[PDB]
Symmetry: C3
């Protein structure tokens, strides 16, 4: 008589209810969702972008009951993710798997905490892997877990029998990014860029006066890594455009069609480099 | 290649289709549902309250085909349950489990008989245990069964991916209650009360002239059992109110807020007793 | 940690996307579905009737990517099935099971290819076997497969939690029929009839001038097989009606109520035969 309770038991402490006493910008509301703690030490919670939208107040009911004060570390509408910290003790966490293992047909359960007093679970499979995960489990900002009961995704209800989650890998990338900066910008060919602060600039033996976008992380098999591009590079110049702003790469790129051969001047180990690169529909 | 057919085979005889040739009170209708036989000897069927609502006629198609005459033993809108008896032979029944075992994540199948000629089955898990069972199996008055294929719930469609059932324990409580009386009233802190008939009154060595509500059954861990209250007690007096009516306890109680310290004079073994008790939101 | 990926891997080559550049009869459209290859040698694809409805163009994206030209071999609105051929090489196919094995409760996965670039999978069980298969897997013209990952059905979305498929047996019957003729007519008591062409007529040692409907295949336990009727018979005469047209059997039959004792003069091995037969509601 197989059952999913055995693993569910294990992975439900690390689920939190989330209430957002917010006003609606120039009428009150109370948006409420669920969330998940990925670091128990630094007490990091993840949740939906849209839940903490317009948040004046941010409160996290633990599973053991501890109603709490949360802090918006950061957001990512680009993937509806959102990072929070709660200052607290005796916090339990359960395992994170690796999305890269996800086959379709793999069994999952979507878990949440819609009412703070409690739990909630649905069942289906990985339906499709489009960067969405698709699933026939019913739907948010909660855990998605595999048949081993490992945290492999985070749930995001949007616009039926079609659940939708975000891989925990992609979700770790934005989080850890958002933690380390007012972060997560995303740009060309699966790369993550940040602002080259003076403090960074010089930290890397460069000058404070020096400028570019800072390639923070290049995701493998990205046309960027293909283009020869790595983390710690400083895009000085996409084509004719002097890149001295981090969000230029994007606005710059967006205004160029697919099948177009682009020249990124990166600045690595104190020397310029053109990089043969290519845009893709 | 695991499958649920093996147990389903076993537990489908005990499923019945139910047609209700009723009129609609001062236009005909024919409400139709499914039902389940819990006692094969006394030929007891359970079903939904709303199906037999306005029933002039009550007919039960067996699984083997025997269209039959049923009798409304009793109802319970309070939990949409409803108890019927069919006078008949060679009746088969399958196992009843224990709801108290139900973990969330546990696999279930919801079964029915919407067309009398036949069968119907859905799949999901125990989602939440609020006194509702929640489930992602699609939806009534039919069996819900565990992965061992045991009868653990009864289905009740109300007002999406959210099935809803009633635990077989709770369902046995009301049934066996309804059988033994024109029964099931429910009242304070998970207790069941009935009318102290003369016949009961004296049966318990009391007088016929004697009055109170008869505590018929106190459910464990109820604030009542906590309050010191047991089955066979006769609530003579909640607070200032002389309880000589069985439904007083309720109307009496309902008109008192939560966190309020209440005095039930019970009459046990021929002596009065105050009981320190407490209401709860 | 059981999972369905292992079998899904195996059975996804044989899934095709299907685009129908059609006009709408006296405005363009592009109806698009999924389909499945049942014969890899003759390159036979099956799909929905309604997808290729009004098809001016018929194109089949393979799973490996090969966009292709298809040909409408034939249709069957009577069961929404439709048969196509694509002229092509290196084509892979996965196993076909036998619907007759299908118990309710049996696990299935519904698979498709709604976007040609890709895959898509849902999960449920065989709910009911009415000649429809009912299922709680979400929904077309795609594979339905058992827990052994065998092709046991084909999907057909019509007019909620109620998927609907057509058994692969029934689906092989119409296909192989449609292949061998401008075929599939269906008629009395689970029999399949075709036009007695001269070429057939004489092929069976008969005359070219000779006429009747050709009983092409009598399905077992059909009242026809019960009526004494077999494949290769030539219904010369249902009752008073001279059957010399193949679709007469139908129009003939349809205009006769249930519980009526019918006389089919068949012509077998060059001799007439009345057959005692019976219609059924």
């Amino acid at each position: 008589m197989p059952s999913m309770a055995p693993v569910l038991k294990n992975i439900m402490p690390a689920i939190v209810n989330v209430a957002v006493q917010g006003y609606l910008p120039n009428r009150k509301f109370e948006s409420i969702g669920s969330g998940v703690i990925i670091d128990p030490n630094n007490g990091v919670i993840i949740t939906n972008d849209h839940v903490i939208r317009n948040a004046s107040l941010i409160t996290v009911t633990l599973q053991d009951g501890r109603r709490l004060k949360a802090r918006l570390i950061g957001g990512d509408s680009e993937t509806d993710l959102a990072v929070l910290k709660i200052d607290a003790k005796n916090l339990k966490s359960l395992v994170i798997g690796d999305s890269d293992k996800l086959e379709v047909g793999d069994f999952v359960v979507a878990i949440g905490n819609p009412f703070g007093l409690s739990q909630s679970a649905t069942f289906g499979i990985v339906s499709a892997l489009k960067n969405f995960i698709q699933t026939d489990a019913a739907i948010s900002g909660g855990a998605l877990v595999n048949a081993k009961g490992e945290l492999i995704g985070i749930n995001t209800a949007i616009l039926v029998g079609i659940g939708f989650a975000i891989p925990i890998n992609m979700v770790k990338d934005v989080a850890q990014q958002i933690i380390k900066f007012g972060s997560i910008h995303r740009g060309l060919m699966g790369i993550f860029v940040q602002h080259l602060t003076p403090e960074l600039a010089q930290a890397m033996g460069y000058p404070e006066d020096f400028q570019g976008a800072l390639v923070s992380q290049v995701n493998p098999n990205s046309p960027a890594e293909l283009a020869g591009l790595k983390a710690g590079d400083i895009i000085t110049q996409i084509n004719d455009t002097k890149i001295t702003q981090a969000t230029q790469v994007k606005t710059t790129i967006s205004l160029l069609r697919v099948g177009s051969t682009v020249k990124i001047i990166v600045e690595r180990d104190n020397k310029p480099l053109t990089l043969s690169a290519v845009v893709t529909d």
